[PDB]
């Protein structure tokens, strides 16, 4: 009843529940949450969009972060567990800089949307 | 996520002070009471929010007897570093066994119940 939380979102409600599938399909859990990254894709420009929950000037709660070509294609993604545990702004940084990571190997440029640089990073 | 309330804002907003200080960082969270405080009926009571059936953030828990004052509190760092339901849990554990070692009977609101301990 009271709403404790503003909720940003990034992604439009189509790009959130779009199915998609993994040429390379690579997989990593990463503490509370899962990466996945398509190894396909290579010397692309990439964002990363994310639906989430903001209190006090910070990341609360990620609902799902995308990986998105400039064509909006998307080629990763991080994800709560499915046993949802709890989470914590660092656990998603500590993701988004594996995903970067693995993305950028492939020849990629990874670009963060505005709204996650300035809540998480 | 909502918001859940066990405190006025005017507990939320009361400054209080310890006879005997006792103060213990507990991972993410501080844990602070007063080691004069016994043989009192104590309820913990917290105001944070809830994302799916479960707490998200403490934003303050506080130690009250049955007259209403102030004995023991658990509050994020002030860098506020994050912290899940499990982080309050455990924080929660310890400041049970310390006020009960202090011969004080406790309790925990229902909505804590609920939501993390």
């Known amino acids: 009843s009271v709403p404790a939380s503003r909720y940003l ?9 779009r199915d998609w599938s993994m040429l390379i399909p690579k997989q990593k ?3 509370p949450l899962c990466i996945r990254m398509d190894q396909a894709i290579m010397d692309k420009n990439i964002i990363l969009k994310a639906n989430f929950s903001v209190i006090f000037d910070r990341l609360e709660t990620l609902i799902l972060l995308r990986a998105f070509t ?4 998307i080629v990763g993604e991080i994800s709560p567990l499915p046993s949802l545990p709890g989470h914590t702004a660092e656990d998603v940084k500590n993701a988004v800089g594996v995903l970067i990571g693995g993305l950028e190997w492939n020849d990629n440029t ?8 300035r809540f998480a990073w």
């Open 110 to 117: 990874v670009r963060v949307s505005e709204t996650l640089q």
């Open 9 to 17: 979102t990034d992604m439009t409600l189509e790009e959130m529940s």
């Open 29 to 31: 859990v990463a503490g």
């Open 70 to 73: 400039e064509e909006g294609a």
